[PDB]
Design a protein around this motif. Structure first.
Motif, PDB file in Angstrom:
ATOM      1  N   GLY A  79     -12.701 -33.408  64.611  1.00 42.13           N
ATOM      2  CA  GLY A  79     -12.801 -32.458  63.502  1.00 42.13           C
ATOM      3  C   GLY A  79     -12.797 -33.120  62.120  1.00 42.13           C
ATOM      4  O   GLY A  79     -12.788 -32.411  61.111  1.00 42.13           O
ATOM      5  N   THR A  80     -12.790 -34.459  62.051  1.00 44.02           N
ATOM      6  CA  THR A  80     -12.554 -35.223  60.821  1.00 44.02           C
ATOM      7  C   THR A  80     -13.660 -36.249  60.557  1.00 44.02           C
ATOM      8  O   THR A  80     -14.450 -36.584  61.441  1.00 44.02           O
ATOM      9  CB  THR A  80     -11.177 -35.923  60.853  1.00 44.02           C
ATOM     10  N   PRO A 101     -17.687 -42.749  55.266  1.00 39.58           N
ATOM     11  CA  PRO A 101     -17.192 -41.718  56.171  1.00 39.58           C
ATOM     12  C   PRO A 101     -17.917 -41.769  57.523  1.00 39.58           C
ATOM     13  O   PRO A 101     -19.142 -41.883  57.561  1.00 39.58           O
ATOM     14  CB  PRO A 101     -17.403 -40.378  55.453  1.00 39.58           C
ATOM     15  N   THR A 102     -17.172 -41.640  58.627  1.00 42.85           N
ATOM     16  CA  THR A 102     -17.716 -41.488  59.988  1.00 42.85           C
ATOM     17  C   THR A 102     -17.035 -40.337  60.724  1.00 42.85           C
ATOM     18  O   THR A 102     -15.805 -40.324  60.798  1.00 42.85           O
ATOM     19  CB  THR A 102     -17.568 -42.776  60.817  1.00 42.85           C
ATOM     20  N   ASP A 103     -17.825 -39.401  61.270  1.00 37.82           N
ATOM     21  CA  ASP A 103     -17.370 -38.288  62.117  1.00 37.82           C
ATOM     22  C   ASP A 103     -16.587 -38.809  63.331  1.00 37.82           C
ATOM     23  O   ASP A 103     -17.122 -39.544  64.162  1.00 37.82           O
ATOM     24  CB  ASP A 103     -18.589 -37.446  62.543  1.00 37.82           C
ATOM     25  N   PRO A 109     -15.091 -31.273  56.572  1.00 42.38           N
ATOM     26  CA  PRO A 109     -15.988 -30.163  56.274  1.00 42.38           C
ATOM     27  C   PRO A 109     -15.839 -29.061  57.347  1.00 42.38           C
ATOM     28  O   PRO A 109     -15.334 -29.322  58.442  1.00 42.38           O
ATOM     29  CB  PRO A 109     -17.385 -30.792  56.304  1.00 42.38           C
ATOM     30  N   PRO A 110     -16.332 -27.837  57.086  1.00 41.87           N
ATOM     31  CA  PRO A 110     -16.625 -26.871  58.142  1.00 41.87           C
ATOM     32  C   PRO A 110     -17.853 -27.324  58.957  1.00 41.87           C
ATOM     33  O   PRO A 110     -18.424 -28.391  58.722  1.00 41.87           O
ATOM     34  CB  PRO A 110     -16.856 -25.552  57.394  1.00 41.87           C
ATOM     35  N   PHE A 111     -18.281 -26.500  59.917  1.00 40.39           N
ATOM     36  CA  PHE A 111     -19.555 -26.681  60.618  1.00 40.39           C
ATOM     37  C   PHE A 111     -20.734 -26.704  59.628  1.00 40.39           C
ATOM     38  O   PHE A 111     -20.701 -26.031  58.593  1.00 40.39           O
ATOM     39  CB  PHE A 111     -19.730 -25.557  61.649  1.00 40.39           C
TER      40      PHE A 111
END
Length: 112
Positions: free
Chosen positions: A30-31, A24-26, A83-85
């Motif tokens: 928002g994803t 996974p990469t930000d 995820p949320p913050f």
């Protein structure tokens, strides 16, 4: 959260040894974007979870794209999560066969 489809509602579990083909990469959109694989023995709606506890006792984060189905037991696939913050551990799978990857979003323990 179970306010959207793929969170504790229902799925035919994968329990053969899963992996990330890409971590996974930000995206900053928002994803968090990943690639995952299943290898053998497994007809399954692939269990994607996001937690604070390494095991998915919490069920934090949302599926951004479709939650896929292993219709060939070797199936590998693009997935995005939200995820949320704040803090998270992205979790791929059920059984000892599951993996996780640590991700913090801006605003709790770190600023980015």
């Amino acid at each position: 959260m179970s306010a959207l489809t793929l969170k504790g509602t229902s799925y035919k579990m994968c329990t053969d040894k899963m992996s990330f083909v890409k971590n996974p990469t930000d995206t900053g959109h928002g994803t968090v974007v990943m690639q995952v694989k299943v290898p053998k023995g497994a007809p399954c709606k692939i269990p994607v979870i996001v937690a604070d506890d390494l095991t998915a006792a919490i069920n934090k984060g949302i599926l951004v794209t479709v939650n896929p189905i292993a219709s060939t037991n070797d199936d590998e696939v693009l997935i995005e999560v939200n995820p949320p913050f704040g803090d998270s551990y992205i979790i791929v799978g059920t059984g000892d066969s599951r993996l996780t990857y640590q991700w913090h979003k801006e605003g709790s323990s770190i600023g980015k």
